Amino acid sequence: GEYASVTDVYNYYKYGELLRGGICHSVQLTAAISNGCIKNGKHNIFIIGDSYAAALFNGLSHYIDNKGSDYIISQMTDGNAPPLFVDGKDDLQRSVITLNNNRINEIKRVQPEVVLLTWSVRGTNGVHDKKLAIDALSLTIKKIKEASPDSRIIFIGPVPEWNANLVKIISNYLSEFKKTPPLYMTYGLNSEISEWDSYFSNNVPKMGIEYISAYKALCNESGCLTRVGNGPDFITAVDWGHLTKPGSDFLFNKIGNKIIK
């Protein structure tokens, strides 16, 4: 039905608009500053990382607007550029190390109240060995603390991932069983992400920063959240894992009060 008709997920979900592509996501530094992506006011929440970090913007914006909060949002994100100093290239063939040097320099300039970070743990320029990944994050943490000693640093952990595009997993369930799946499910759910979330829950707080489990916010004993309504416009992920607007909104409804007291 409606789920089977979504065959081009990036066009259907307006994926560029979702991440603020061409404005704050995957842009040159002079464009980022001119477009107002780096705020200098009080109560500034400064997002850094790859497209998983960009996907947080919608839910945080919605939480602030719904609460009538005076908090503001900065964003320096780029596809295939985690907030880790790894010698790889982003989607525009730029140096991931150069991009992270520029992010640290802007954090130093504006002294934000909060730095909010995440990445795609299985992505091209991620770090696959969990212990070496903690060591790489420790280098970023030390640079942020030196640049802006009063900033709170918050790592929002990995979101749930699926074995194909989530809309295709739901279409597959309907074709096999001719029944709508449950709201929370393990059908088509990737088993590795829970292991990353558990490792970070145990080890990140000892590094002198805050950890928020996105996985525990979106998952329960029945599995992980597929949707907040009937049809493709209400599912939680664009592809295997990048949050839709409804997915991002649900996450921040759950975790926003851990960021804004």
3-state DSSP assignment of residue 192: helix
Beta-ladder partners of 44: 72
Closest C-alpha to 84, from 96, 92, 71, 67: 96
Q: Is 76 exposed, middle or buried (0-12, 13-18, 19+ CB in 10 A)?
A: buried
Joined tokens for residue 141: 């943490």
Please, are residues 247 and 56 in contact by the beta-carbon 8 Å criterion? no
Cited resolution, angstroms: 1.1
Q: How was this structure determined?
A: X-ray
Backbone angles phi, psi at 191, to 5 degrees: -80, -20
Closest C-alpha to 118, from 48, 180, 175, 18: 48
Q: How far is CA 213 from the centre of its chain?
A: 12
Q: Locate tokens 């477009």: which residue?
A: 35
Joined tokens for residue 88: 């790889």
Q: So where are the chain's domains?
A: 9-258
Task: For the domain covering 9-258, report its CATH number.
Answer: 3.40.50.1110
